[model samples]
Target: MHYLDNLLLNTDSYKASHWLQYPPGTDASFFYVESRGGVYDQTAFFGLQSILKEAINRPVTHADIDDAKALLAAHGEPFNEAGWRDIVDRLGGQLPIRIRAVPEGCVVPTHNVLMTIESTDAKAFWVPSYLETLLLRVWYPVTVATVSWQVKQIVRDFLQRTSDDPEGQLPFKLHDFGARGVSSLGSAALGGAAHLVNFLGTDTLSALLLARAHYHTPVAGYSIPAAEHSTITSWGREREVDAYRNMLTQIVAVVSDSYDIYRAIREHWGTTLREEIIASGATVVIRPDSGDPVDVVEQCLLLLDEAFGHQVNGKGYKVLNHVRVIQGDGINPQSLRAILERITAAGYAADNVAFGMGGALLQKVDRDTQKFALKCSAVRVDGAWIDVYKDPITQSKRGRLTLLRDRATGQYRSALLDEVATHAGDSDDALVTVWENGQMLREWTLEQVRAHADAARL
Candidate 1:
């Protein structure tokens, strides 16, 4: 049996026994996923479409049940042998769950419902919670998207204040450089795709593959020819000019800090290769890979201006002709903001620099980063629906939930699912049924995701 194909075994061990733990009268269970609130005030919802198409929409098989039974029995966890057989024999192996979610790429405020799941068949009440192990993993992509979006807002603010064309340049300002820093290829793909919702530049090839396969996009991201340290240093320190020259011949971006970043900028880039770079008629993006990001970027901009000169745009900010800088060394939200601030203070436009985020973009976040949680909000017992929730220090929302946007304020709030129509005249309910009973109900393209995210940008 293919290990990862068995949805029955894709859950926590404790979930194996939950089929027997619900109250005796319980017939149907309802759960919702939300960000209880953490580092960010809002979440850029993403990756659920990929999960639905890749995992949840598939049917279970007798082989899967048998394999899960053998493993759980040996592991001393109570296996729901009869329940598994009932699902395969009666339901034809399709999970009897309906998943409704805020459309992918919609940025919803924290503590608001992003997704809701309930058993479509009363007999399959245990299925929703059993899939939490896989569903909750959406937190990673959503958190990555949130972080990327927040950074976009930071860049946007600076551009609107300093540059003539904020919208035109915002899309390519932040590039994904997190593939190698992430734990796995899947992490890179998911997190990288999330970042693509906010920006158009990426170095993660896996993200492009994922967008094509899952989101039905022909080209979801773009990248230019770039160089790493290996290509630059292989020529030896004394021959750095040859390496830079070779890169200028083919690549548009080259890392210049293998030795002394400042000297390479002043001597090699600003002086030696200055004419070749300008004559190429393409923007040569100089990457500074080390040192204090703010100081190094400031000094590089100063040297580039001194050597190449600059043009004052109509907005009164300086732009280096035929050259730019990409700081990929130490970039997080704080450092990115600081670097942008220093350059703008130095009379440079936001277009003078771009950013490539690595670990902070993909690996440094956790479930707690946005305080994501999936909890049973309401359960049907016998014939009655009852609210179920936790309280005290960590309170979870109760009752069936739906996300609604107030027409006047344009802000989102969570309300009871039944109350959706009550506010229909003035509010817009955002959740749509995206998955149901082993089938994907809606598929969002990468273009649609990007548009929705851009529209919601602050």
Candidate 2:
């Protein structure tokens, strides 16, 4: 099957358009595509080549045009049959686009070209132009990865000051509970995989499948035998203590607010189930699902300390015995910081509490959160390289020109094609040629991407 068959399958069928108003090789051109906006200072880029790699086995062919034409016509959109015929006649019904991009797991900054596209024979520019819709899928994982990385940074910052083993504690601190809160399975997969770039604890099992499938890994994340409100509350509020007690004997998390959150943490689990908890020698992760996180987390810590007592760890942070808290609701990057600050200010260390973010971790963000965009930067026309850019009236919409590697600094800086050609060097460009002509030059695993992201941190 043709590459466009698989490529176009993942996207909305309406996106396919004529490669030109006429034919292939008619107007030889190149289109430099990039992530123009979004959180510019991204820690790691995740899923950068997923779209390209998806089509590596499905190269475009003449036969694909007929099916594509059928698909286009079925979608009730304008079908440029003449242009399709010309492309098939000129190029033997095969796609003619080349992709150059950064490695999937590398760190990227604002204005650095992440990916570029152009016709293979330099004439079917529009062949790759329609693919911009599919390429923009990169923003989901990239932004989610950045946000997850930023969340890890927050937890790491606090853990360094509070935990005896900050590195070991970092993974369990920010768990991904956002899987069920996302829109669909695909969203969960992408967002969940993005989170694994930073933390290893996740309830999103599909993320593991995604990691294994896309990133070539075993298990990218982990989870605990945990309970939700229904599991506990169904035992009835009167038997809530039994619900909490039964959840022990292993590292188990029981929702603390099945009835009264304060009562469950302080009077019930903290007081009523205190002996069983200590005797069970099991870590009980108590979850408070509602209320202001900063306030409730602080109160929960204080109450748990009063009931179970605390021992000072080697890191000079107070460790609540046999008990940990996970605040799983209303958590975003901002609220997460507030809770951490509140806990530390109240004389407890950051490790005493982990976070379980739902909507805020994945569903709450958008393209504007980092302002991501992919635009054409340069095109080769009639054997001359011309720099291409768009400076919209909106100042933020101004895009970068063609990219080049500078040996002087070992980094990517943009300029016109002629200028970039002169300044180009072998020092390694930011834009590595990762995919071309339906071939993936390099394949990255989750661990490799994780290492790159972690190493990029301050």
Candidate 3:
């Protein structure tokens, strides 16, 4: 935001066209209350291209000031996509955005941003295509983290009631199954981030590296795909059973998903798979790769019990005895709720069962507090780019020039603001600096930032 505001400030007032005028009495309250997302339309092509083209022509230099000035000069009239992309190429620097998410270690639903856009100039706002990637990165782990905690907590509560210490439990060691389900490398990063927030681990090794590097959390490594996240066909069955056997020598908690789940479990995956799994000294997980996953597990339970005999206890799962049945599909908590009910109703233990959330967690997230979404809410009314914002329960202000602050008391908040809405004196207060030889001052990373954010969340 410091960089963003500076870019806007330096942007010549002449180029800002998309700046709309939501009259003071405009019922713009709905803006904050609504979440708009789809793929961003290509209508912004002209401006985006202009920006991209220039960026490619000139390497970044002090002319970045001129270049941005040119953009600002040219931008005052309308919203243009090509213009923005062109500007992006002109100043592509080394990736300097090191984002840190808040409530980073939690179960996040759709649209939660751990943190984002801590970069210079308008770089944060330049790439809308990049936004989807970051959003997925920021939110997916939240979903994993949340579910991981649930796995731990649910087991803990059941044990507490039964007077069984949790020490006897199998392990919180887990995995996040989201390779093919994700859109791209960028989407995968979300799973990695979310894994760091929780106690269990993720199967996304690439994401694990990034998450470990950023969040300081190690992910459990277990790669077992019954049908390779595709239509569970014989090709899937052929390899998945053998796949678990190969993984046992490595680490523990291998993920298994069968395309033709029941048949694979009873025929292809039954006796041979179990012997191979237990022999390797690893607990095999029979993950339902498709279908009404919970109900399927209920049926698998009866089969496992009929064959193996010992009721699983915490050791793994039903019927399969030494084998665990994990669920991976479009399984959210609500979906899991119904599945769990049926699992217990069938007189089978679902305690050892778990889940694998897909990109849905990250991709589906967009409207919550972690939301890093912004549109040109409003433009400058006078000399200031007056962005407006208001919380329903709070005093209703319209467009806001968002000011994020951190205070000494370890708090943070952001106010949706009109650039001029602040005390007039505050406007001239040092928002950003560009001096390099001794005078270019960047924006203050004042401690007030956290406090400011705190104010807004509160």
Candidate 4:
């Protein structure tokens, strides 16, 4: 039977283009082709997809394979020699075992082990060739999701500390202003959505596209248009000043810093702009993209407060509030801290300032300084496989294979386990189900993903 399958499948390899097109010398080191050509008596693609899905879900068992076979046979009705052979071979092999590096938001150290997987038989172990794309997709997001969340928390902490009306500062807290510089659209959403989990995001239109997809929060509004982030000066100097002011007061709060920033406030803000804002009864904020943000903010505060040697309370202190400042670019945790120090030194309340942190966030973390990498650690062992996992070095929270679910409560333990422990006995609330053999489940809509992540938080 093995020799016959080799001959027929080898010949049918050409016909596989109808189903899939594997280039010659293509990496098949990890995955074995389960179907050749016309392998199923009737159903075309059902056999292969059914078992692959089960294996992909991993940490599943033989009951899973049986479910897959039953599913395939039920759907196919009249099974063929090729169909029977494909299932027998795929289910006949052993699957690999692997483990995760850490639970979400566990604050791990750099180079700390993230995950590792092993299986008794080399062939049964999931290999890089088979897991390559899926592994990166599943693992990398945890990195991005976790990193973005950390950055948001820092930003939130800073904002909460800085605001006069800490109560008034959030639920519309931040802006995913890095769209111009974020890695891509997907990143724009992921980074944007992750932050929304903490600070309220201000990217209403574009970001909400992703927010609605994965996060439960409302989309704040997008970073002020790119025009506002850049020098709006024309041959005359800058033009978008009016448009920029329109947003600060007219639109939800947005940061404005695209010009010779210091001058931007001096020229437009205090004169006609101030009058327009006062008359319009709208609030506008000035964001500085250059210079020492701390210094510029001090100057702006002094001017807004009419603090030029002004006398008040029988002393020389200028009283000001209402007008605000947001700082962007060339910012890091240190920069955030520096600005905070200066704001306090100048006697300004912290809420007067906010932030839109990027690169440092996408590339660096300030928490226990944990570096995240989603390395592949396991695969479907034989057809009767259970996705294997390593026990975390510490007990208490060991060996969970569930995808994280978000919750409303604020805590690192917000994620709910989605899989049963690799070593646990069968129970009513097991993490996952194994039908169609051992298929992994997947979802694609942004709203679906948004609901999914929102549910992860408590």
| Top candidate by TM-score | 1
Q: Cα-based RMSD of the predictions, in order?
A: 2.0, 3.9, 11.3, 13.6
Worst 10 residues of 4 by lDDT: 39-48
lDDT of each: 0.87, 0.70, 0.40, 0.40
Candidate 1 lDDT, tens digit per residue, 302-344?
Answer: 8778767899988899998877999988899899999998999
For residues 215-272, write the lDDT of model 4, one tens digit per residue: 3335433454333434344323344565555444323344444344345456645466
Of the pair 2 and 4, which is ahead by lDDT?
2
TM-score of each: 0.95, 0.86, 0.50, 0.52
- Global local distance difference test of model 1: 0.87
What are the per-residue Cα lDDT tens digits for candidate 3 across 217-325?
3543436444344432333665655554554545244444343434545674566655665566555566654567666766655655554555544434332457666
Q: How should the candidates be ordered by lDDT, best one leading? A: 1, 2, 3, 4
Q: Candidate 2, residue 431: CA error in Å?
A: 2.1
Better of 3 and 4 by TM-score: 4
lDDT of 2 by residue, 342-414 (tens): 8887778888999987777778778777767766545555565554545644432222235555577535555
lDDT at residue 54 of model 1 (Cα atoms): 71
- Summed over model 4, clashes come to 60
- Whole-model alpha-carbon lDDT for candidate 4: 0.40
